[PDB]
Design an enzyme around this catalytic site. Sequence first.
Site, short mmCIF file in Angstrom:
data_model
loop_
_atom_site.label_atom_id
_atom_site.label_comp_id
_atom_site.label_asym_id
_atom_site.label_seq_id
_atom_site.Cartn_x
_atom_site.Cartn_y
_atom_site.Cartn_z
N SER A 137 -6.50 5.70 10.41
CA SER A 137 -7.24 6.48 9.39
C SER A 137 -6.43 7.75 9.10
O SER A 137 -5.20 7.67 8.99
CB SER A 137 -8.66 6.71 9.84
OG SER A 137 -9.46 7.05 8.73
N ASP A 416 -9.74 -3.30 3.88
CA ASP A 416 -9.95 -1.91 4.30
C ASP A 416 -10.27 -1.05 3.09
O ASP A 416 -9.48 -1.02 2.14
CB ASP A 416 -8.66 -1.41 4.98
CG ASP A 416 -8.77 0.02 5.48
OD1 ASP A 416 -9.88 0.63 5.54
OD2 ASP A 416 -7.70 0.54 5.86
#
Length: 484
Positions: A137, A416
């Site tokens: 992330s 994602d």
Amino acid sequence: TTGEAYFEQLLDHHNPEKGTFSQRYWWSTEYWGGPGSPVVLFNPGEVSADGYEGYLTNDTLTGVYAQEIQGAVILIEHRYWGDSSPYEVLNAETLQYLTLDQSILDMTYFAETVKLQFDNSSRSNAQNAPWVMVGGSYSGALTAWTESIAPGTFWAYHATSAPVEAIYDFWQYFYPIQQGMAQNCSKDVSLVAEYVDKIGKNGTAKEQQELKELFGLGAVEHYDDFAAVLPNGPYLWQDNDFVTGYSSFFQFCDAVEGVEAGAAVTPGPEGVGLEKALANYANWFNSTILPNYCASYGYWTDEWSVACFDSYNASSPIFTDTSVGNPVDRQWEWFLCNEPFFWWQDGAPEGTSTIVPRLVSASYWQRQCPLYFPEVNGYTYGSAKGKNSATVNSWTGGWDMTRNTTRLIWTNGQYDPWRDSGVSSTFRPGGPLVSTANEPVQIIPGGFHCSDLYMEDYYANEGVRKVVDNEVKQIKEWVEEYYA
Ligand SMILES: *[C@@H]1O[C@H](CO)[C@@H](O[C@@H]2O[C@H](CO)[C@@H](O[C@@H]3O[C@H](CO)[C@@H](O)[C@H](O[C@H]4O[C@H](CO)[C@@H](O)[C@H](O)[C@@H]4O[C@H]4O[C@H](CO)[C@@H](O)[C@H](O)[C@@H]4O[C@H]4O[C@H](CO)[C@@H](O)[C@H](O)[C@@H]4O)[C@@H]3O)[C@H](O)[C@H]2NC(C)=O)[C@H](O)[C@H]1NC(C)=O
Ligand SMILES: *[C@@H]1O[C@H](CO)[C@@H](O[C@@H]2O[C@H](CO)[C@@H](O)[C@H](O)[C@H]2NC(C)=O)[C@H](O)[C@H]1NC(C)=O
Ligand SMILES: *[C@@H]1O[C@H](CO)[C@@H](O)[C@H](O)[C@H]1NC(C)=O
Ligand SMILES: *[C@@H]1O[C@H](CO)[C@@H](O)[C@H](O)[C@H]1NC(C)=O
């Protein structure tokens, strides 16, 4: 064994005379092969690091790396989160040093100079042993950006689901969710989102108020605040991994499709149509999401409060809470507004199908930056000064930082929500990054956010196993080059 310690970090790496603050880190030598062995460094990123013990263990990818290379594991809490903040109050003045360059130099300075309790010599610092920086992330972008901006301290890097490209109108956040979700759900959610837009743009006041009441939100006074609750369904896709099963997201889609769990009869790909989908989506939010939603912030206690949806109330505690341990990730909102990363999670542009209302727009989010961060003693946030995404991307290289890399491997997830901010974005100019031996990149099929980080995914899914196996062998090969 394990422990925790503080590192005396520079407040401003460009001006050491401004002094230091204490930055928390945890460490484990469970797999460590002794002084001179590798060090795996993991920054949990946009969060306090206290609930992250598992990254020291081989239940996570960082532990697996460490066991493979006989490395120590270090978990470092990011500046301004948790017990690593220089100030007790976070405002546009005190957050001036919460920048990406300071955050990168924190990592290299730490690796170069920390005195580790488990090796009092210099033999485990980054000048003398190979440090492998791992991140998912935002911390995966921090990891890649460190290789870009400050190479030569860390030996190797792994970035998974990394948002290396700043994007203002990040409507693409929702694009992989639309691609991964079921056809009927996708179609019906889009019908509802576009109906919400029609009523906001072309409907009468009586039509707008009546639509809000369907959701239980009659007291929400600004239409865009109502529209902004619809993404709560799609956002649950971010919580999926390969072991979440019949998760909150899949419950949301069954509700939209009007079926109970395990129902014998289900709609086909054509879905149920606008009228039923709207009624089902409204009741799902009203009955499953709204109760105790505002109370979860702590500021409110009433079960049916809608105060937390009012983004136009400059006095809301969501904006006025300046404490380090706030529940609104104020520190992250600073990066979004100040660096600026933005990544505003928006409906898609006209002519492109969307699963969230186009009325949830970049300007709707940007409008909140000066509510979070009112001017203090002459200080403001970077995007008010005219900085934009290209200010960041032309420095770091954005998703084109892939040009000439060394010992950096990438992982991304097919579905994602952060894929289209990264090197595997389908909207990256010239297409997604092509893997090479010098610079490998793997996309996990059916993958979500950081799906290779959690080893439960490894055992649950052969696609993840193939990706993890490949990157672990690549890291070991690169680390061996340190000793050869
Ligand atoms: C039309 O509308 C209807 C109504 O809404 C739609 O029906 C719903 O469709 C949902 C999506 O397909 C479905 O949810 C699924 O439920 C099953 C259980 O029935 C569940 O297995 C699914 O969850 C798996 O997959 C997701 C997505 O990757 C994972 O996040 C989740 O953790 C589960 O992963 C496990 O199974 C996968 C196999 O599919 C593996 O890839 C994965 O690695 C993992 O494997 C572990 O578990 C396995 C157990 O099978 C095991 O074999 C393996 O060894 C590992 O241990 C997901 O929740 C709803 O149930 C369904 N609702 C109903 C029927 O009422 C319909 O799709 C729509 N159709 C169209 C055409 O639009
Ligand atoms: C939709 O949300 C409203 C709140 O806006 C819920 O209204 C509350 O309902 C309970 C009964 O369950 C009452 O005790 C409260 O006084 C109501 N507050 C109101 C109307 O402001 C309503 O129950 C929700 N509907 C569904 C189906 O969950
Ligand atoms: C985790 O470590 C234990 C050591 O007891 C080992 O048996 C196990 O295979 C390891 N798991 C992984 C995924 O490396
Ligand atoms: C705005 O926030 C303050 C502080 O929580 C509160 O007293 C006031 O009622 C809020 N106004 C609305 C319309 O929610």
